[PDB]
């Protein structure tokens, strides 16, 4: 078979070339090219023969698919396609990396390489590929060919394109493309080519595609942008005694503390169940569930998406719970738990510091991998029956590696303490639509909350 005869029609090819050259939009029955937020093009009915495409779908669906998972994505990818001998796949390689490539090279004036770079992806319920720019040395043009059944926005899996802010960081979704059978999309890989595949919501259907890159000369990426560090602050000096009113007495016993520290020093992590006194814990959950709290959304999408409480406007019990975690007394307690020097009265410049926030996590929220030693603290509220399959767990990994070192699962009134070295990173995995199963049990609840603090020696 062959890709659409109608785009190789020379008058159209030259008009497309002009539009590329001038970075100007161009619309036609068989091809649309847009420049906002960045250069992307859509070719419906990319391949003329429906029979070839059905034969292609069949071969692909008869491949073995392996699970792909990390902070950025969750989906299935095929046995690789490059050396694959099945005839429809073989033909497609040639259609893409000889015929279509020469056409693209001509209109783009980019000398694209023959290098074959293509995979087959399957996205099903809860699968998603979050905000990213495709940047990798050599990648110049991204392409995706959809081989999906009848598809609509409600089924998810949209190819979303982001606008960008002053600092070359993604701002928000300004284009959302719906996949459809035999539609090809391609776009330029650049420092601003931010995009995602939105979560697939259909529980029945499977989003099938061929995707990859045409390789070309390495462009010029600008300097790596570093966000303004979140302000840190020393402990709130002690006025009134606050620990014995808030903390489970078990954990305020000295002999239990040395045992905790013994365990903590071996693994540099611990999990303390029923950390707060239930009297307080329930008042805290009560306020979160029935009180007035002002939330704001945190970004940008290529780093994070979750809700954070406006701390100054919190109900007193939540204000006080935050003050607890900022308090001199807790700094000292954590020293006793960990053997870290977070207070001057703890055994043996430096002034210890912390940053903290009250977070709300629900469907769609996440953080991604982006150096310093630090102690992470999390206290979970309102997540009974929360399942790992929902996402929302915190995963710790070794840097420059795919190795998970630890997983923290939301559990009510459990305090997780985890020490990070400079070669250790963390993220909160994308919370997917299975989490809606929560409402079968707690109909008036949506997601869960935590107190998330970081302490520095
Ligand atoms: O499949 C899509 O619609 C978009 N794919 C990608 O951005 C990718 O695989 O890197
Ligand atoms: Mn991509
Ligand atoms: Na570490």
Token pair in block for residue 119:
């995979």
CA dist., res. 188 & res. 133, Å (int): 10
Q: What is the DSSP letter of 438?
A: G
Helix segments in 236-315, DSSP class H: 243-246, 254-267, 278-290
Under CATH, which number does the domain 1-222 receive? 2.60.120.620
Find out whether 207 is annotated in a ligand binding site: yes
CA dist., res. 341 & res. 132, Å (int): 38
Which of 118, 129, 148 is the best mutation target for the ligand 1 pocket, counting ligand atoms within 8 Å of the beta carbon and taking the most?
Answer: 129
Spacing, Cα 196 to ligand 2 middle (Å):
7
Which of 76, 119, 142 is the best mutation target for the ligand 1 pocket, counting ligand atoms within 8 Å of the beta carbon and taking the most?
Answer: 142
Token pair in block for residue 440:
């079968």
Find out whether 133 is annotated in a ligand binding site: no
Q: Are 29 and 9 in contact (CB under 8 A)?
A: no
H or E, element range at 449: strand 448-456
CA dist., res. 453 & res. 451, Å (int): 7
Partner residues linked to 213 by β-bridges? 142
Q: Are 170 and 177 in contact (CB under 8 A)?
A: no
Residues in contact with 419: Cβ distance below 8 Å, sequence separation at least 6, in sequence order: 264, 268, 269, 338, 340, 373, 374, 375, 376
Atom of ligand 1 nearest to the CA of 177: 3
233-234-235 Cα angle (round to 5)? 120
Q: Is 166 helix (H, G, I), strand (E, B) or coil?
A: coil
Q: Are 352 and 370 in contact (CB under 8 A)?
A: no
Spacing, Cα 384 to ligand 2 middle (Å):
35
Q: What is the DSSP string of 70-97?
A: SSSEEEEEES-STT---HHHHHHHHIII
List of E strands, 104-253: 118-123, 128-132, 139-146, 159-164, 170-177, 184-188, 195-197, 207-215
Sign for the pseudo-dihedral over CA of 319, 320, 321, 326 = positive
Q: Are 133 and 139 in contact (CB under 8 A)?
A: no
- 149-178 exposure pattern, b = at least 16 Cβ within 10 A, e = fewer: eebeeebbbbbbbbebeeeebbbebebebe
Q: Say how far residue 381 (Cα) sits from the centre of its chain.
A: 22
Q: Are 51 and 78 in contact (CB under 8 A)?
A: no
290-294-296 Cα angle (round to 5)? 130
Atom of ligand 1 nearest to the CA of 212: 9
Closest Cα partner for 392 from 71, 86, 120?
71
Strands 170-177 and 32-34: unpaired
Torsion of CA 401, 200, 147, 174, to 10 degrees: -90
Distance set, CA 442 to CA 295, 382, 385, 411 (Å): 21, 10, 9, 15
Q: Which ligand has the shortest distance to the CA of 418? A: 3
CA dist., res. 380 & res. 415, Å (int): 7
Spacing, Cα 177 to ligand 1 middle (Å):
11
Torsion of CA 391, 397, 403, 409, to 10 degrees: -30
Find out whether 366 is annotated in a ligand binding site: no
Tell me phi and psi for residue 272, to 5 degrees. Answer: -110, 110
Q: Are 395 and 367 in contact (CB under 8 A)?
A: no
Which of 211, 214, 302 is the best mutation target for the ligand 1 pocket, counting ligand atoms within 8 Å of the beta carbon and taking the most?
Answer: 211
The domain made up of 223-457 has a fold known as Jelly Rolls (2.60.120)
Give yes or no on whether 1-222 and 223-457 have one common fold: yes
Residues in contact with 300: Cβ distance below 8 Å, sequence separation at least 6, in sequence order: 165, 169, 170, 171
Place of tokens 């559990």: 411
CA dist., res. 9 & res. 29, Å (int): 13
Token pair in block for residue 91:
């033909």
Spacing, Cα 211 to ligand 1 middle (Å):
7
CA dist., res. 394 & res. 409, Å (int): 7
Sign for the pseudo-dihedral over CA of 25, 156, 367, 358 = positive
Resolution at which this structure was determined, Å: 2.1
Spacing, Cα 399 to ligand 3 middle (Å):
9
Q: Is 450 helix (H, G, I), strand (E, B) or coil?
A: strand
10 Å CB burial of residue 337 (0-12, 13-18, 19+) is: buried
Closest Cα partner for 447 from 356, 389, 382?
382
Q: Is 120 helix (H, G, I), strand (E, B) or coil?
A: strand
Distance set, CA 70 to CA 121, 130, 139, 149, 223 (Å): 15, 11, 21, 27, 26
10 Å CB burial of residue 85 (0-12, 13-18, 19+) is: exposed
What are the sequence ranges of the domains in the chain?
A: 1-222, 223-457
Torsion of CA 343, 321, 269, 435, to 10 degrees: -160
Spacing, Cα 406 to ligand 3 middle (Å):
10
H or E, element range at 183: none
- 42-63 exposure pattern, b = at least 16 Cβ within 10 A, e = fewer: bbbbbbeeeebbebbbebbeeb
Residues in contact with 129: Cβ distance below 8 Å, sequence separation at least 6, in sequence order: 72, 73, 75, 123, 196, 197
Partner residues linked to 174 by β-bridges? none
CA dist., res. 50 & res. 56, Å (int): 10
- State the first-to-last Cα distance of the chain, in angstroms, to the nearest integer: 65
CA dist., res. 231 & res. 245, Å (int): 29
Partner residues linked to 42 by β-bridges? 32, 185
Q: Which ligand has the shortest distance to the CA of 372? A: 3
Distance set, CA 188 to CA 13, 45, 104, 334, 443 (Å): 18, 21, 11, 50, 44
Q: Which residues line ligand 1 (CB under 6 A)?
A: 129, 134, 144, 159, 195, 197, 209, 211
Quick count: other Cβ atoms within 10 Å of Cβ 384?
15
């Amino acid at each position: 078979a062959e890709f659409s005869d109608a785009v190789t029609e020379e008058t159209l090819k030259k008009q497309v070339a002009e539009a590329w050259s001038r970075r100007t939009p161009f619309s036609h029955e068989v091809i649309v090219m847009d420049m906002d937020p960045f250069l992307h093009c859509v070719i419906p009915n990319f391949i003329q023969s429906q029979d070839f495409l059905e034969g292609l779908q069949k071969e692909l669906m008869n491949l073995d698919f392996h699970e792909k998972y990390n902070d950025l994505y969750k989906f299935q990818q095929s046995d690789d396609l490059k050396k694959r001998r099945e005839p429809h796949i073989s033909t497609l390689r040639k259609i893409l990396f000889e015929d279509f490539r020469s056409w693209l090279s001509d209109i783009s004036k980019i000398d694209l390489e023959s290098t074959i770079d293509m995979s087959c992806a399957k996205y099903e319920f809860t699968d998603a590929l979050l905000c990213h720019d495709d940047e990798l040395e050599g990648r110049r043009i991204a392409f995706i060919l959809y081989l999906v059944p009848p598809w609509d926005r409600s089924m998810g899996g949209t190819l979303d394109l982001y606008s960008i802010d002053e600092h070359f960081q993604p701002k928000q979704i300004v284009k959302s493309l719906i996949p459809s059978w035999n539609k090809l999309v391609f776009f330029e890989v650049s420092p601003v080519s931010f995009h995602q595949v939105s979560e697939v919501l259909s529980e029945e259907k499977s989003r099938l595609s061929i995707s990859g890159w045409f390789h070309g000369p390495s462009l010029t990426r600008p300097p790596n942008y570093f966000e303004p560090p979140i302000p840190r602050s020393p402990h709130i000096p002690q006025d009134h005694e606050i620990l014995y009113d808030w903390i489970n007495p078990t954990y305020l016993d000295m002999d239990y503390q040395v045992q905790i520290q013994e365990e903590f020093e071996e693994s540099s992590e611990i999990l303390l169940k029923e950390f707060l006194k239930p009297e307080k814990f329930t008042k805290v959950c009560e306020a979160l569930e029935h009180g007035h709290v002002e939330w704001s959304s945190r970004g940008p999408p290529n780093k994070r998406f979750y809700e954070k409480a406006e701390e100054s406007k919190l109900p007193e019990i939540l204000k006080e719970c935050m003050k607890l975690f900022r308090s001199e007394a807790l700094f000292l307690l954590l020293s006793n738990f960990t053997g870290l020097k977070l207070h001057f009265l703890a055994p043996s410049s430096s002034v210890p510091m912390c940053q903290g926030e009250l977070r709300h996590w629900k469907t769609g929220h996440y953080t991604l991998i982006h150096a310093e030693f630090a102690l992470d603290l999390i206290l979970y509220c309102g997540c009974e029956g929360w399942e790992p399959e929902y996402g929302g767990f915190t995963s710790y990994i070794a840097k420059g590696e795919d190795e998970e070192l630890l997983t923290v699962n939301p559990e009510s009134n459990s305090l997780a303490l985890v020490y990070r070295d400079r070669e250790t990173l963390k993220f909160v995995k994308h919370i997917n639509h299975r989490s809606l199963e929560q409402k079968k049990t707690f109909p008036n609840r949506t997601g869960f909350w935590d107190f998330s603090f970081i302490y520095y020696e």
